[PDB]
Design a protein around this ligand. Structure first.
Ligand SMILES: O=C(NC[C@@H]1Cc2ccccc2CN1c1nccnc1F)c1cccc2[nH]ncc12
Ligand SMILES: N[C@H](CCC(=O)O)C(=O)O
Ligand SMILES: N[C@H](CCC(=O)O)C(=O)O
Ligand SMILES: [Cl-]
Ligand SMILES: [Cl-]
Lengths: 248, 247
């Protein structure tokens, strides 16, 4: 079995990491559109065209399944990609919705969706949660988390101040937080710490991680050390250097 | 006269603002590569290709001069674009060197270059400054200023914390600060305020504004309006930004 993983750049490595530790595939063709990243600050028309173009990249690699690791592409382009595509394409949004159903039985539990601007604006997460019965959904574009994490600012007063900037306006105190962006797992502990420390919270909110959720989904569909090809629209060496650090 | 202005996205509006204020040109074709912005976190190979493709865009427009408003493309791609262009291309690095030569007589005056990671990595500013005899040159990639400014984070604790993060390891106390990036003029006052506070200065450092330097350069060099906006992303989003950046 040989699959491809598509992402806007290097944030996809947080999904690639979970896929690797589940050893469900033999061959993984990773493609990151690092020349044009990020997608989250751009518009639906551009993003959809990007997704269609990613389809053309994988054509000569003869994969049987495409994982869209990017939450932004999953939110804006997955539908259009699935139309033009003969192999199945699994994004990271629907699998997270399934994990929420399994881990969050109270449909009134306050859920907070975190993602890029484009992802939040699309309402992909909110619409899918509502169709599954959830009645207490909040969403927040935390755009600056992406560049902060990509600069390796994973702790310190800059990250803390960025979190306070996004989180201080929150009306509802969340029980569940959806990490609806490839980058956010790298600061998951810090997001937890923020809510425990800023509110009288003994335990932290529950965090839904997109890579762990797609793996659960994929395990409920396929059978039980993989080769990995790294491709990039930018400098592939720069992307590979990034991979070594993300996959730690 | 009809010219082109090229930028990676909306940052170039800080150059367009200076051009419009100076009333230099009757017709201006602005092109922002907003589908692929930012350039400054990317690699020299990618950026040079971006520059060459920018030339293909202006071909049907019959411009007489291309202003490369982007400091990153000025630093990595300008030499290659000029190889393949019959019309003169002017970037925003060389004009800033002239601005400094005109305003900074002392060769030992400490100059601090701020720009993207790619702009700083190229050493385009330091090399031109050393060639002109300046002895005290420092540089600093302040990458996160770009997404902060594009989020309209132009004041407050987050910006102040970002400035401190970048400026704290500074050895030198600058008399000159090159705003070597389209976005940085939008926080010029905050940068001045930072350095006056933390080094107890009676007057602010001299900030070199790329847009103002190119205006002065074009006036000296050419003895001297309708804008149309184009984008590789949604042009409506870029024009919405134009209203905000252009005052
Ligand atoms: O190829 C290896 N290293 C070089 C390659 C390119 C490169 C260039 C400049 C700085 C760093 C890197 C890291 N690189 C990659 N790192 C992770 C995944 N893929 C890669 F291509 C490699 C081989 C066997 C075990 C490893 N563990 N870590 C890396 C390796
Ligand atoms: N991969 C994107 C984050 C980076 C980007 O904006 O392209 C996501 O998962 O939303
Ligand atoms: N226009 C770029 C800033 C934004 C980008 O990185 O593309 C510059 O002047 O360096
Ligand atoms: Cl990292
Ligand atoms: Cl702004």
């Amino acid at each position: 079995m040989k699959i491809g993983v598509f992402d806007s750049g290097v944030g996809g490595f947080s999904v690639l990491k979970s896929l690797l530790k589940a050893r469900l595939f033999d061959e993984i063709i990773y493609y990151g559109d690092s020349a044009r990243v990020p997608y989250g600050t751009k518009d639906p028309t551009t993003i959809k065209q990007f997704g269609l173009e990613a389809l053309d990249f994988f054509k000569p690699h003869e994969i049987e399944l495409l994982i869209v690791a990017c939450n932004t592409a999953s939110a804006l382009a997955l539908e259009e990609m699935q139309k033009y595509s003969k192999i199945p394409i699994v994004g990271v949004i629907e699998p997270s919705i399934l994990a929420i159903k399994r881990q969050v039985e109270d449909k009134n539990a306050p859920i907070l969706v975190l993602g890029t601007k484009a992802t939040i604006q699309s309402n992909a997460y909110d619409n899918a949660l509502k169709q599954q019965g959830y009645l207490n959904i909040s969403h927040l574009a935390t755009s600056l988390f992406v560049p902060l994490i990509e600069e390796s600012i994973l702790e310190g007063e800059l990250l803390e101040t960025c979190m306070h900037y996004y989180f201080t306006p929150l009306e509802i105190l969340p029980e569940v937080i959806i990490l609806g962006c490839t980058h956010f797992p790298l600061i998951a502990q810090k997001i937890e710490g923020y809510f425990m420390g800023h509110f009288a919270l003994p335990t932290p909110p529950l965090l839904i991680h997109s890579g762990d959720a797609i793996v659960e989904y994929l395990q409920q569909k396929y059978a039980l050390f993989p080769k990995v090809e790294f491709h990039a629209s930018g400098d592939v060496i720069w992307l590979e250097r990034q991979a070594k650090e993300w996959l730690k």
